[PDB]
Design an enzyme around this catalytic site. Structure first.
Site, PDB file in Angstrom:
ATOM      1  N   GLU A   1       0.918  -1.132  -0.125  1.00 36.77           N
ATOM      2  CA  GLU A   1      -0.012  -0.038  -0.129  1.00 36.77           C
ATOM      3  C   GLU A   1       0.683   1.200   0.072  1.00 36.77           C
ATOM      4  O   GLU A   1       0.498   2.183  -0.888  1.00 36.77           O
ATOM      5  CB  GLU A   1      -0.971   0.081   1.149  1.00 36.77           C
ATOM      6  CG  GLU A   1      -2.183   1.011   0.951  1.00 36.77           C
ATOM      7  CD  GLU A   1      -3.224   0.343  -0.151  1.00 36.77           C
ATOM      8  OE1 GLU A   1      -3.623  -0.689   0.123  1.00 36.77           O
ATOM      9  OE2 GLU A   1      -3.199   1.292  -1.224  1.00 36.77           O
TER      10      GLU A   1
ATOM     11  N   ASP B   1      -6.329   7.376  -4.634  1.00 33.71           N
ATOM     12  CA  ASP B   1      -5.881   5.854  -4.925  1.00 33.71           C
ATOM     13  C   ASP B   1      -5.701   5.837  -6.207  1.00 33.71           C
ATOM     14  O   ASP B   1      -6.053   6.796  -7.149  1.00 33.71           O
ATOM     15  CB  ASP B   1      -7.062   4.982  -4.441  1.00 33.71           C
ATOM     16  CG  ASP B   1      -6.446   3.635  -4.302  1.00 33.71           C
ATOM     17  OD1 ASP B   1      -5.571   2.862  -4.792  1.00 33.71           O
ATOM     18  OD2 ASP B   1      -6.892   2.595  -3.451  1.00 33.71           O
TER      19      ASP B   1
END
Ligand SMILES: C[N+]1(C)[C@@H]2C[C@@H](OC(=O)C(O)(c3cccs3)c3cccs3)C[C@H]1[C@@H]1O[C@@H]12
EC number: 3.2.1.17
Length: 429
Positions: free
Chosen positions: A207, A216
């Protein structure tokens, strides 16, 4: 008396073994960069305590026992004691420092693991010896001058203020029983939670980390490590859900602490999900730490509902058929959305190793702890006992307990080497 003297030297043998073992620890650590680490640093401190105690206490102790009398007089007696208790104290506090260290490693990834160095370790240790010294030495040396007289008769030596079996009891509990209990607590906790370190570095790579709300790769609003906020494009939604999550007004930003805590929440939720699920659980039972951690990655990403729809794959993952599992996963929509991450996870599946993430897979604490407790508690129990009956313990038993308290310091290097092959090969040479 003849047989007594003949057996007496055994102690000397033990003291020698102690001093050489410890001296080996010191040298090996200083001469091999591999051995230089925070944990190994604390282990150096310990070996030091054991050395100073093995070259001094064990010996003058052997002397005192042999002669049946104390020859060197008052001040020698004072320094011997003080060095002894200050030292062994620093040894217990060193053990604590260790346990708490590994703990803060597991529980506080960002705050602790990230900033920890041999410098900080040095400081902590030095501070520990300070505390030890300041607790014992001033008392042991200056008790006489304080009270005005010297309780100790010439010929037999011991700590002045420790005459009473009670104050001795309380101080043993405080200085032993408490710290031991705490080490046990921290221990079993660490022993339960060890994998969160590896799974942490894992999700960390995959991540990444950002403290302030960012978009994102998918575009979804997401914060912290792997914590998804919302897929709705309105920033208000995200920030608000986030606020719900933190319990503060985040204003789009959070602290590293908040972050690490969020991660932990997440992972605990992931796991709890794997165990609550009828699908992910049994499979998750047959998985080794690496692969299992992979599973926890996927679950930490798509959710239990999500990762449970992989049954085609789950089947083979449980049947230990790898290449086929991977092949089955590459064809899904998951791999299509974010191929890199998934590729790392899957490789982790096939190989069964962290090498995809270049990740290094509690150690030795079992040994050290066990040695410590089992060589101390006889004596502490003997003290707890002496609290309640005056004459039940002959001086012999005291001496014996003492010796054990030493063979701890003897056995600690032994546990070092025996646990780490590194120390093995480093000693051999
Ligand atoms: C062999 N010792 C040298 C002696 C006996 C043992 O002592 C201990 O285990 C005690 O819990 C105590 C013993 C007696 C009163 S409190 C500690 C002492 C100092 C720090 S913790 C272990 C060590 C320590 O120096 C004493």
């Amino acid at each position: 008396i003849w047989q007594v003297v003949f057996i007496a030297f055994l102690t000397g043998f033990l003291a020698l073994v102690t001093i050489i073992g410890n001296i080996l620890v010191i040298v090996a650590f200083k001469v091999n960069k591999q051995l230089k680490t925070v944990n190994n640093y604390f282990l150096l401190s310990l070996a030091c305590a054991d050395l100073i105690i093995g070259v001094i206490s064990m010996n003058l102790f052997t002397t005192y026992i042999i002669m049946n009398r104390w020859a060197l007089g008052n001040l020698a007696c004072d320094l011997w004691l003080s060095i002894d208790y200050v030292a062994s104290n620093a040894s217990v506090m060193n053990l604590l420092v260790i346990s708490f260290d590994r703990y803060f490693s597991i529980t506080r990834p960002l705050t602790y693991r990230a900033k920890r160095t041999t410098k900080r370790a040095g400081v902590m240790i030095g501070l520990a010896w300070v505390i030890s010294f300041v607790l014992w030495a001033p008392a042991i040396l200056f008790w006489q001058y304080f009270v005005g007289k010297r309780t100790v008769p010439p010929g037999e030596c011991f700590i002045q203020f420790l005459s009473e079996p009670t104050i001795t009891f309380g101080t043993a509990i405080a200085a032993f029983y408490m710290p031991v209990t705490i080490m046990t607590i921290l221990y079993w906790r660490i022993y339960k939670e060890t994998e969160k370190m590896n799974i942490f570095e894992m999700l960390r790579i995959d991540e990444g980390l950002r403290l302030k709300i960012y978009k994102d790769t998918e575009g979804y609003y997401t914060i912290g490590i792997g914590h998804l906020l919302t897929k709705s494009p309105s920033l208000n939604a995200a920030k608000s859900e986030l606020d719900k999550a933190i319990g503060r007004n985040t204003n789009g930003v959070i602290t590293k602490d908040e972050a690490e805590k969020l991660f932990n929440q997440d992972v605990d939720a992931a796991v709890r999900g794997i165990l609550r699920n009828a699908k992910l659980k049994p499979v998750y039972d047959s998985l080794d730490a690496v692969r299992r951690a992979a599973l926890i990655n996927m679950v930490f990403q798509m959710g239990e509902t999500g990762v449970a729809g992989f049954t085609n794959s789950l089947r083979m993952l449980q049947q230990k058929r790898w290449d086929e599992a991977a092949v089955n996963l590459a064809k899904s929509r998951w791999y299509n959305q974010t191929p890199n991450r998934a590729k790392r996870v899957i490789t982790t599946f096939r190989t069964g190793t962290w090498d995809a993430y270049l990740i290094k897979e509690a150690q030795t604490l079992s040994a050290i702890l066990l040695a410590f407790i089992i060589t101390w508690t006889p004596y502490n129990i003997m003290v707890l006992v002496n609290t309640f009956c005056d004459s039940c313990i002959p001086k012999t038993y005291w001496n014996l307990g003492y010796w054990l308290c030493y063979i701890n310091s003897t056995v600690n290097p032994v546990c070092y080497a025996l646990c780490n092959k590194t120390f093995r090969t480093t000693f051999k040479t």
